[PDB]
From a paper:
The JmjC KDMs are grouped into five subfamilies (KDM2/7, KDM3, KDM4, KDM5 and KDM6).6 They have conserved 2OG and Fe(ii) binding sites, the precise nature of which are subfamily specific. The different members of the JmjC KDM family accept different substrates (typically methylated lysine residues on the N-terminal tails of histone H3, H4 and to a lesser extent H1);8 selectivity is mainly engendered through differences in the substrate binding pockets and by the presence of other recognition domains in addition to the JmjC domain.
It was proposed that the triazole-N atom would be able to coordinate the catalytic iron atom and readily enable alternative vectors for compound elaboration. Although compound 14a is very small (MW 190.2) it shows a preference for KDM2A and 4A/C. This is likely to be due to residue differences in the active site of the different JmjC KDMs. Although it was not possible to crystallise compound 14a with KDM2A it was co-crystallised with KDM4A as a surrogate. KDM2A and KDM4A have similar substrates and are both able to demethylate H3K36me2.8 The co-crystal structure of compound 14a confirmed that a representative of the triazolopyridine series occupies the 2OG binding site in KDM4A and provided insights to inform the design of KDM2A selective inhibitors. The triazolopyridine scaffold itself does not extend substantially into the substrate pocket. However we anticipated that through the introduction of appropriate substituents on the triazole ring at N-1 and C-5, the activity and selectivity for KDM2A could be improved by making interactions in the substrate pocket. A co-crystal structure of the simplest example 14a with KDM4A demonstrated that it binds to the JmjC KDMs via active site metal chelation. A new KDM inhibitor scaffold has been discovered through the incorporation of an alternative triazole metal binding motif to the known 2,2′-bipyridine-4-carboxylate scaffold.
Residue numbers in the entry: 4 to 352
């Protein structure tokens, strides 16, 4: 039944009405009832009626406390990205650098051309990314899909322990320029993410279906045996770039999609994704959860080589939503096998 929905595991695109848009978790359950999650990634175009902010005309004074310069080393589709933190910088300061001749977007016809230039010039002329900036650009009154307060069960982490995890249960802003990249990865604890492109040039995405996620990991371990030896989940470092041609060459299924300003992207549990920004832009994102995520959370394979990595206690989720398995899980005997095709329980409504 779930297997017969989106059997291609293709990236789907949704155009909700304004009435459908009002209840966030309900629409996530809906697009899962249509098999969107099998792709790992889905686009959701909100009604023209909607806007999270009246104008972006005041933000040139907003500070980017830790701009990152992205050095990239590699060849023939395989790359490792190193981060060089620059000194703090305002948005107007950043836009100036980004729109300057040295860093601006090259001219091109179709997207496949800009794509080709991206993978051709990835290692040259290191751009700067205004990444992981704590904040939101939603006006305080917007209630539909407000990244600052989605009200999903991920809120249970803060409710129970008081713990905030920047960018995970709090929002991050991302100021991009041409050729700034996000490496191949899943979310922390294999959560969902929501990404909103407030303004600027597009952001292109690659996705690998969760049901093929393990195939991508085997390939990545093969190409980076050193990194694999020293960490059980090195892709969570978010340093590893792999071109779509390399994926084709080794039979990994994937899809691609380009995100325009004013569009949402949803990534799903264990959905590997990567991509790049076309030019100057601004994006807001955070993580969230559904009842389906819990099993993913229990089984997420985490980065083993840093003490500073994101680790969420699953205990309170298992107690509340899987009480009959708590004794078993806590005794390490819960061998529930995940079916990636199944939609989340809430989609019964
Ligand atoms: O750089 C982005 O726009 C982006 C896109 C997709 N994922 C992330 C990200 C950063 N940490 N977890 N996920 C960042
Ligand atoms: Ni992500
Ligand atoms: Zn690690």
């Amino acid at each position: 039944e779930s297997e017969t929905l989106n059997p291609s595991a293709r990236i789907m695109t949704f155009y909700p009405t304004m009435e459908e848009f009002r209840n966030f978790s309900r629409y996530i359950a809906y697009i899962e009832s249509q098999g969107a999650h099998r792709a790992g990634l889905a686009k959701v175009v909100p009604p023209k009626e909607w806007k999270p902010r009246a104008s972006y005309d005041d933000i040139d004074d907003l500070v980017i406390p830790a701009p990152i310069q992205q050095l990239v080393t590699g060849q023939s589709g395989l790359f490792t990205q190193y981060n060089i933190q620059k000194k703090a910088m305002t948005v107007r300061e950043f836009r100036k650098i980004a729109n300057s001749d040295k860093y601006c977007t090259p001219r091109y016809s179709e997207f496949e051309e800009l794509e080709r230039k991206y993978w051709k010039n990835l290692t040259f002329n290191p751009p700067i990314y205004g990444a992981d900036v704590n904040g939101t650009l939603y006006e305080k009154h917007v209630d539909e899909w407000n990244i600052g307060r989605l009200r999903t069960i991920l809120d249970l982490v803060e409710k129970e322990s008081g713990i905030t995890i920047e960018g995970v249960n709090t929002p991050y802003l991302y100021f991009g320029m041409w050729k700034t990249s996000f490496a191949w990865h899943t979310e922390d604890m294999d959560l969902y993410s929501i990404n909103y492109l407030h303004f600027g040039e597009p952001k292109s995405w690659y996705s690998v279906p969760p049901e093929h996620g393990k195939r991508l990991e085997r390939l990545a371990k093969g190409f980076f045996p050193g990194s694999a030896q020293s960490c059980e989940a090195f892709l969570r470092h978010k340093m590893t770039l792999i071109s779509p041609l390399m994926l084709k060459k080794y039979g990994i299924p994937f899809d691609k999609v380009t995100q325009e300003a004013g569009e949402f992207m949803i990534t799903f549990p264990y959905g590997y994704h990567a991509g790049f920004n076309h030019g100057f832009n601004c994006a807001e994102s955070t993580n969230f959860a559904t009842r389906r995520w819990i099993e993913y959370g229990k089984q997420a394979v985490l980065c083993s080589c840093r003490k500073d990595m994101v680790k969420i206690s699953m205990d309170v989720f298992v107690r509340k939503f899987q009480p009959e398995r708590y004794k078993l899980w806590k005794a390490g005997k819960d061998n529930t096998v995940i079916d990636h095709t199944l939609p989340t329980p809430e989609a019964a409504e």
